Short mmCIF file of C-alpha atoms and ligand atoms in Angstrom, two decimals:
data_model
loop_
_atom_site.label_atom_id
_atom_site.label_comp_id
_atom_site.label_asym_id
_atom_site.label_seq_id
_atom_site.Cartn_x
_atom_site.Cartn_y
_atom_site.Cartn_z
CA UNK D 148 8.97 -23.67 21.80
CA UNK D 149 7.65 -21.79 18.60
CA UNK D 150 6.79 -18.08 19.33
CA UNK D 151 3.69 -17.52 17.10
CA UNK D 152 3.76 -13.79 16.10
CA UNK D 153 1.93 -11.47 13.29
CA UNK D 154 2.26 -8.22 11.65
CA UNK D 155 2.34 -5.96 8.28
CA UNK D 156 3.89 -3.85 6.21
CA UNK D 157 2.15 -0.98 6.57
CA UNK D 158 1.77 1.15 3.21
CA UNK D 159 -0.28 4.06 3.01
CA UNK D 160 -0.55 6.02 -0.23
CA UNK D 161 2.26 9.35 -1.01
CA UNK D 162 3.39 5.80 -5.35
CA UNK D 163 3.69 4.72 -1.73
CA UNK D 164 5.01 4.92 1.88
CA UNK D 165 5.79 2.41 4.58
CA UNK D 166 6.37 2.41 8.29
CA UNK D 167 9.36 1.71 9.71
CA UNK D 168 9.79 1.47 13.62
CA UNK D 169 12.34 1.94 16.16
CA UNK D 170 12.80 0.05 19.19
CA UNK D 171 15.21 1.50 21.98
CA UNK D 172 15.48 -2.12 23.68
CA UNK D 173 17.23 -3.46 21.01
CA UNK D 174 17.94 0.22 18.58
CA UNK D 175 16.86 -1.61 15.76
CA UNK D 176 14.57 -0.67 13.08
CA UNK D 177 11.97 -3.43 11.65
CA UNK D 178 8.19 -3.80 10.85
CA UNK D 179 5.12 -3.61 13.36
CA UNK D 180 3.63 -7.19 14.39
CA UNK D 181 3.67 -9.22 17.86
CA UNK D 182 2.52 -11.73 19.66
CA UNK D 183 -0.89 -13.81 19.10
CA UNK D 184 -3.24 -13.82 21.97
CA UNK D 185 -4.77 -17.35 23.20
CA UNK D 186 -7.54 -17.97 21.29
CA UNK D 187 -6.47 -14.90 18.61
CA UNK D 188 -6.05 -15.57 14.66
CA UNK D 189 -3.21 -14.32 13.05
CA UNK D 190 -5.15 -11.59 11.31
CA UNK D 191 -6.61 -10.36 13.90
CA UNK D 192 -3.13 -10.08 15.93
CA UNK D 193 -1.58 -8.50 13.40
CA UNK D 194 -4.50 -5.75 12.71
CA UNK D 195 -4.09 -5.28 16.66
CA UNK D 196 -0.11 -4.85 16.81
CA UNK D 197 -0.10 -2.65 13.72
CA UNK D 198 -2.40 -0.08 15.50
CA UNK D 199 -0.45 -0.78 19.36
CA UNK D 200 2.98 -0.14 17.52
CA UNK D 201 2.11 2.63 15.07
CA UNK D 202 -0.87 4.08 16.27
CA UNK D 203 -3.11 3.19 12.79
CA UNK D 204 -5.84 1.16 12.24
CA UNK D 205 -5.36 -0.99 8.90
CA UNK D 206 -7.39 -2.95 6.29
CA UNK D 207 -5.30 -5.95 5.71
CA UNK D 208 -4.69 -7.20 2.16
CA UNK D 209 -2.69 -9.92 0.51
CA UNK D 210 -0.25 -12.06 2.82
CA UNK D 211 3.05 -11.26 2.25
CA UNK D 212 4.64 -14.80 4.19
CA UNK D 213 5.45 -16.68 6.79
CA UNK D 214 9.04 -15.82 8.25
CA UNK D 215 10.99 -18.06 10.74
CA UNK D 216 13.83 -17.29 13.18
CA UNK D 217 16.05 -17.96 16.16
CA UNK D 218 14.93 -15.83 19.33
CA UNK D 219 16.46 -17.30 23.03
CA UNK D 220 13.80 -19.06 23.94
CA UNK D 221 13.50 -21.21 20.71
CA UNK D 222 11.85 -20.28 17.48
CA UNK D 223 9.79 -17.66 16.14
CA UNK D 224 6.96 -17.90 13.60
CA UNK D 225 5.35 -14.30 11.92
CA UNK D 226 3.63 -14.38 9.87
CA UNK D 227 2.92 -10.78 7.62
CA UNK D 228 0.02 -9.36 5.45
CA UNK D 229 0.25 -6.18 3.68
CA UNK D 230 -1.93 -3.51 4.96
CA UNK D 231 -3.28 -0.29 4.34
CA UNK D 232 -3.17 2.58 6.92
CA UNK D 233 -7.24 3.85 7.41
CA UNK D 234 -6.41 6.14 10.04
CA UNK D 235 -4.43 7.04 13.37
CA UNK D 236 -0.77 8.52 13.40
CA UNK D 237 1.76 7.48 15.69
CA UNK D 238 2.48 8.23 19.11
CA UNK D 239 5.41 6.56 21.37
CA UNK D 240 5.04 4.00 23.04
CA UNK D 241 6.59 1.50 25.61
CA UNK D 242 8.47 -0.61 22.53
CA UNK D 243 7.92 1.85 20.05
CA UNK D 244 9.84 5.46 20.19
CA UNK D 245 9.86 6.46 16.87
CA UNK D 246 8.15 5.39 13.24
CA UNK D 247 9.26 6.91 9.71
CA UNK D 248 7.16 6.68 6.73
CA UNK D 249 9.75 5.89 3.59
CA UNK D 250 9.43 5.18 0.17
CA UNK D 251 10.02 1.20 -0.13
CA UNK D 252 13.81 1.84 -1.54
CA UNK D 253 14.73 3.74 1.20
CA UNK D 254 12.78 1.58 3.72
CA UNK D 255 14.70 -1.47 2.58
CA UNK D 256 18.07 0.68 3.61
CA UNK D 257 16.45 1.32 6.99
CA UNK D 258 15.53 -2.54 7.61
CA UNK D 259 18.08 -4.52 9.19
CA UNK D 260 17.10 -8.04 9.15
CA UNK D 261 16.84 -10.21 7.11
CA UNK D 262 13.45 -11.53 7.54
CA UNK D 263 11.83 -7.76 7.41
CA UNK D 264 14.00 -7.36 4.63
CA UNK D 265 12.46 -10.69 2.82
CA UNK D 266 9.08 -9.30 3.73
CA UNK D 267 9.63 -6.04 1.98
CA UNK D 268 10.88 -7.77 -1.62
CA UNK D 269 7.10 -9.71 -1.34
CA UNK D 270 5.59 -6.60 -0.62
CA UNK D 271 7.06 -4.80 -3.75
CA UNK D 272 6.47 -7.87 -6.30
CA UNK D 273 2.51 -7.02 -6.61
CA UNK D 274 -0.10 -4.26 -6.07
CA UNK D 275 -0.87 -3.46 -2.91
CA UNK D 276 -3.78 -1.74 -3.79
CA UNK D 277 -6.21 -4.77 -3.57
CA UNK D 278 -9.57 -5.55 -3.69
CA UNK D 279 -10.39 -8.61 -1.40
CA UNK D 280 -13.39 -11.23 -2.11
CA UNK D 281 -13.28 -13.55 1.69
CA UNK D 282 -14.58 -17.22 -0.01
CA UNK D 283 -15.81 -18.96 3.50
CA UNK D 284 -16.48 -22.82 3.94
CA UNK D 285 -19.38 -22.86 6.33
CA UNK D 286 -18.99 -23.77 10.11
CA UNK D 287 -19.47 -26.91 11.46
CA UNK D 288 -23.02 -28.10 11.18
CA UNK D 289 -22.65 -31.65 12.72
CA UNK D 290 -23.21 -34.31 10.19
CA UNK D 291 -25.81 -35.32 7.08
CA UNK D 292 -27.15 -38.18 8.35
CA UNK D 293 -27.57 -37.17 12.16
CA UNK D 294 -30.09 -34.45 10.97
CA UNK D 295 -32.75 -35.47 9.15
CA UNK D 296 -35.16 -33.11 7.73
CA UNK D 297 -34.26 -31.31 4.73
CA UNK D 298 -30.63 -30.72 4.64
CA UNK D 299 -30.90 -27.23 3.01
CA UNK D 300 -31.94 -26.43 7.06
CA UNK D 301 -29.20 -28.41 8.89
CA UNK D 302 -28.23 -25.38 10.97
CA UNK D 303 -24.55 -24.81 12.66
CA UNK D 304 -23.61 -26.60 15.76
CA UNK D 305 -22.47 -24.90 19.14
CA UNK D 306 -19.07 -24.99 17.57
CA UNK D 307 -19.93 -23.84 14.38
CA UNK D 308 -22.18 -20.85 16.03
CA UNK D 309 -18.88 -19.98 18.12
CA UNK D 310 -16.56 -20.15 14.68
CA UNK D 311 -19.33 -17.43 13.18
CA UNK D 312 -18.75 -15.36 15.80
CA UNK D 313 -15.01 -15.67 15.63
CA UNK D 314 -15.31 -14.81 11.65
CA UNK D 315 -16.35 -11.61 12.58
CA UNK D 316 -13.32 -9.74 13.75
CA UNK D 317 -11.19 -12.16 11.22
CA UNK D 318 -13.46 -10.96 8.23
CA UNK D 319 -13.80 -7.08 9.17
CA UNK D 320 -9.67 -7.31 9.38
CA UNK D 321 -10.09 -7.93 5.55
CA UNK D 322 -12.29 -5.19 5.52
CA UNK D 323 -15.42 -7.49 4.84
CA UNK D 324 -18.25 -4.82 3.18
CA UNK D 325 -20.78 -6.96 1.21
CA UNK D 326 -22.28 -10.76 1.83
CA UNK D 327 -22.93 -13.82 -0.19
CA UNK D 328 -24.05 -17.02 1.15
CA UNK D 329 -24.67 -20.38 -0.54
CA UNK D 330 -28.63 -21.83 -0.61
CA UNK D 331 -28.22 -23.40 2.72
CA UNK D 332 -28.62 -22.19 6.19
CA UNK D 333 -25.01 -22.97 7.37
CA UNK D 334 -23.75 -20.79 4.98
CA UNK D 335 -25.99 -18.14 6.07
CA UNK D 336 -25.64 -18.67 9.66
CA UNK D 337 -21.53 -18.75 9.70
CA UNK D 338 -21.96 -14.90 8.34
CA UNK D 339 -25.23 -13.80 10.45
CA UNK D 340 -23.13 -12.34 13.27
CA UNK D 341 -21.24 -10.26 10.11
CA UNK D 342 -24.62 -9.21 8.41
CA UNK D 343 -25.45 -7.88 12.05
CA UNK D 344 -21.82 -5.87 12.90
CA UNK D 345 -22.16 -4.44 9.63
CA UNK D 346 -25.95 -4.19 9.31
CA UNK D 347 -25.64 -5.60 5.82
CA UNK D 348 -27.88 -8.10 4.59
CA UNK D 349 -26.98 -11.34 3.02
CA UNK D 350 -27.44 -12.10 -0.18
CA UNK D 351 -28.34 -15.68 -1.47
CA UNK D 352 -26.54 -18.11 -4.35
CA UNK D 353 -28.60 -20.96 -5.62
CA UNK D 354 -25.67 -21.22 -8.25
CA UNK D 355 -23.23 -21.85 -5.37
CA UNK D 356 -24.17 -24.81 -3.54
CA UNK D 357 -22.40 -28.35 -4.05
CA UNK D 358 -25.20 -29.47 -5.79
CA UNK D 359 -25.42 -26.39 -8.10
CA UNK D 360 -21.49 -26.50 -8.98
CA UNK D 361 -21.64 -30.47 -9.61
CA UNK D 362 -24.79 -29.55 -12.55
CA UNK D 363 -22.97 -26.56 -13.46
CA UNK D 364 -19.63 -25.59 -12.46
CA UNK D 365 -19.79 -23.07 -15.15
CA UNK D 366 -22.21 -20.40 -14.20
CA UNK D 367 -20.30 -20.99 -10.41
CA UNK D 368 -17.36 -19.85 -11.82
CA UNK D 369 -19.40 -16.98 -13.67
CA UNK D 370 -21.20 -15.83 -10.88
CA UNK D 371 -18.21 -15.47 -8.91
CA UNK D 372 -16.12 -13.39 -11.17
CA UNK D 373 -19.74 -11.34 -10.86
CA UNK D 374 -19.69 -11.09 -7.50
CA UNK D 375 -15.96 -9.79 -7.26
CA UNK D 376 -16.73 -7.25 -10.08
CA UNK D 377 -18.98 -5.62 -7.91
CA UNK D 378 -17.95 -2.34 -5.90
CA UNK D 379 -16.34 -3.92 -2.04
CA UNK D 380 -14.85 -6.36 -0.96
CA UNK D 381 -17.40 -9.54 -0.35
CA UNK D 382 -17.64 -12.82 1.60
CA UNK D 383 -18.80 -15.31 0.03
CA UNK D 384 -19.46 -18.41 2.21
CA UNK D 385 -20.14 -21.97 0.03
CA UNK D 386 -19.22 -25.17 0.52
CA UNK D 387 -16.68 -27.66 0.88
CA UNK D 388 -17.19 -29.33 -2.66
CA UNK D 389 -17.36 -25.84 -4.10
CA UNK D 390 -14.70 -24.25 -3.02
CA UNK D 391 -11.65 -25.96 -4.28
CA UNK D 392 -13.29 -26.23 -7.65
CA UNK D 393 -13.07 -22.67 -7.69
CA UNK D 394 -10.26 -21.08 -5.96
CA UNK D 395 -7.89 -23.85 -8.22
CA UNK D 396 -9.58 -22.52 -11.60
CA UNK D 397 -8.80 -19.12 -11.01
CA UNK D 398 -5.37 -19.54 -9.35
CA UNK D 399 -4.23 -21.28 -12.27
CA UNK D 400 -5.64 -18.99 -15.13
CA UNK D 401 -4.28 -16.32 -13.11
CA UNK D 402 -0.80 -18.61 -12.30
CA UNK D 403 -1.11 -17.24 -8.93
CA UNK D 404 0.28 -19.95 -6.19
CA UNK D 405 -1.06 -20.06 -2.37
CA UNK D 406 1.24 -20.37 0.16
CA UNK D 407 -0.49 -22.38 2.08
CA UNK D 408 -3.65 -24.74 1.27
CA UNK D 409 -6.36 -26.59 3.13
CA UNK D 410 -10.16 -27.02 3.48
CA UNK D 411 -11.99 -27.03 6.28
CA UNK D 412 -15.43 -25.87 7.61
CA UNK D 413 -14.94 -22.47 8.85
CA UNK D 414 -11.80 -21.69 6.55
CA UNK D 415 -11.19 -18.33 4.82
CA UNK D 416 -9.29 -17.81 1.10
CA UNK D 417 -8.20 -14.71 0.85
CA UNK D 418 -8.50 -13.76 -2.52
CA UNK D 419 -6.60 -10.37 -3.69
CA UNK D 420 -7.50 -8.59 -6.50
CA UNK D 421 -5.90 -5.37 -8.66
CA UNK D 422 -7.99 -3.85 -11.06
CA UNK D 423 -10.17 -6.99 -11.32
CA UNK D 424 -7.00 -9.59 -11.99
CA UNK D 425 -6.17 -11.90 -9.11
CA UNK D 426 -2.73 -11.72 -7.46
CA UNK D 427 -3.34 -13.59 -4.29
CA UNK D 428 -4.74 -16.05 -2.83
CA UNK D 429 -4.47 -16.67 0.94
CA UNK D 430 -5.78 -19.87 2.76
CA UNK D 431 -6.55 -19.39 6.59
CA UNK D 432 -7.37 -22.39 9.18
CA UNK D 433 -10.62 -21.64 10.99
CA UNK D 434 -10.20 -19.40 13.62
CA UNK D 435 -10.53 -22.23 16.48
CA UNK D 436 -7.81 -24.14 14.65
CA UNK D 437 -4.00 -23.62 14.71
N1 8DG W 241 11.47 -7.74 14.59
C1 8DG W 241 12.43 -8.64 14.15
N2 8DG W 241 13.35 -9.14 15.00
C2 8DG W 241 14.29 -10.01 14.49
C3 8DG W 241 14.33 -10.43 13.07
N3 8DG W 241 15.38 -11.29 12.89
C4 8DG W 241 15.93 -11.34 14.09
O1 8DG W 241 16.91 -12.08 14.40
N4 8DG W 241 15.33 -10.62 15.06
C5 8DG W 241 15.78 -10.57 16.43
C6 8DG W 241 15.70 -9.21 17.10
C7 8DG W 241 15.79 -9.65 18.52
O2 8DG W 241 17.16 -9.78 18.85
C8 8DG W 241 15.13 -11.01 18.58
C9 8DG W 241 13.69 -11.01 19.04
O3 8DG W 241 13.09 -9.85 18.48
P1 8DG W 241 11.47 -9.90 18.12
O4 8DG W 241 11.13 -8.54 17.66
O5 8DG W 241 11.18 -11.09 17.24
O6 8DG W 241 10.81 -10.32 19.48
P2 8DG W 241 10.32 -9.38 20.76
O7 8DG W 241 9.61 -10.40 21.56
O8 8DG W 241 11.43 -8.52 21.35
O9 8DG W 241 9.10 -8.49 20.10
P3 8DG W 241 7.55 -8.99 19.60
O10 8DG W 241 7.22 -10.40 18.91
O11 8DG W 241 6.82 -8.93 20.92
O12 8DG W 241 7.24 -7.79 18.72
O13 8DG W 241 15.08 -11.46 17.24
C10 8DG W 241 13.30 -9.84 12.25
O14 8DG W 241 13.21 -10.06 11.03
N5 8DG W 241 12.43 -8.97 12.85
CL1 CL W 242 2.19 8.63 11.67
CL1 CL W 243 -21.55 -30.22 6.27
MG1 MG W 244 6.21 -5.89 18.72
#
């Protein structure tokens, strides 16, 4: 079976340090993550595991990879995110005895496998110092023609209420401050239960519906490069005709490549931004989905 397993490289300013920890089971040296919960996104596993292992809470940024490798049982899947330490310091624990902060030269030394190793060269080959803008398909909102009424109103489904609320420990691992929603209520409603954790009101985008891109893609584009300019890091949550429009514009103007790709109603692209440029750009299944 396939071990599913997430965690960072931790980073927190000095040019910059990273955590390295020791494990007396094994004496080895490698890079915080574990296990995913049932039910538990990879993001939000790997914000948990950082802080278990080195005692930090961290702000996630860009994803650094997936990594794959033999264990005894089978296979193990880990995927890794930089992140940024926003507080805590280390204490030892039942895996964890010790934890060095190290420049990422000497870090690399201190490594000893090769997948942590791998990890660290994707780490080093952009800035870590991102800015993050969270573009969110709505949740599911059953379909067009089963709701009549105006379809600006077609509101989530049970589903699609239970997605929003999953969004909010996903988003907040991103570090989520500020929130955009297309002119419809889905959008809206898939980032209510944010607005509410971080008593932040939502702010609404005629110029980002479907039918607002397909008359003007244009001022879309526009009024997203707006809304990342802005001081935070924002969620934007549009639609499904919307959002590949727009995430494939910039990614190729910036010749950034995604990892991974998809679509679907409750999805998250991580976009990563230093000093305004994009160099990331992170696609995450919903957080009901695999
Ligand atoms: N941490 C880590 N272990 C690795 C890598 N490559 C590699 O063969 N291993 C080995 C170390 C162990 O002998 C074995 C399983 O270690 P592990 O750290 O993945 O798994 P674990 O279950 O003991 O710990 P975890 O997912 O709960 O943190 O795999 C790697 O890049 N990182
Ligand atoms: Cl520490
Ligand atoms: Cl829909
Ligand atoms: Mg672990």
């Amino acid at each position: 079976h396939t071990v599913r397993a997430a965690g960072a490289v931790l980073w927190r300013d000095a040019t910059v340090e990273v955590a390295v920890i020791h494990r007396p089971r094994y004496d080895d040296w490698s890079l915080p993550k574990g296990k995913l919960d049932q039910g538990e996104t990879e993001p939000v596993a790997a914000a948990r595991e950082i802080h278990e292992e080195t005692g930090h809470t961290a702000v996630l940024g860009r994803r650094l990879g997936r990594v794959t490798y033999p264990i005894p049982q089978g296979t193990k899947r880990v995927w890794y995110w930089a992140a940024k330490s926003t507080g805590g310091d280390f204490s030892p624990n039942d895996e964890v005895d010790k934890l060095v902060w190290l420049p990422v030269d000497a870090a690399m030394d201190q490594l000893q496998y090769p997948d942590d190793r791998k990890v660290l060269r994707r780490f080093v080959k952009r800035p870590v110092d991102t800015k993050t803008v969270l573009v969110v398909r709505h949740g599911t909102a059953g379909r067009r023609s089963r709701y009549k009424g105006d379809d600006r109103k077609r509101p989530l489904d049970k589903r699609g209420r239970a997605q929003a609320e999953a969004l909010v420990a996903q988003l907040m691992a991103f570090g989520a401050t500020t929130l955009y929603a297309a002119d419809r209520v889905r959008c809206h409603q898939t980032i209510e239960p944010l607005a509410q954790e971080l008593d932040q009101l939502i702010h609404n985008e005629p110029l980002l519906t479907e039918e607002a891109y397909a008359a003007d893609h244009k001022a879309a584009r526009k009024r997203l490069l707006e809304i990342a300019g802005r001081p935070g890091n924002p969620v934007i949550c549009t639609q499904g005709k919307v959002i590949p429009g727009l995430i494939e514009w910039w990614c190729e103007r910036a010749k950034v490549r995604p990892e991974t790709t998809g679509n679907r109603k409750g999805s998250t692209w991580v976009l990563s931004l230093s000093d305004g440029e994009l160099v990331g750009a992170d696609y995450l299944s919903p957080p009901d989905e695999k």
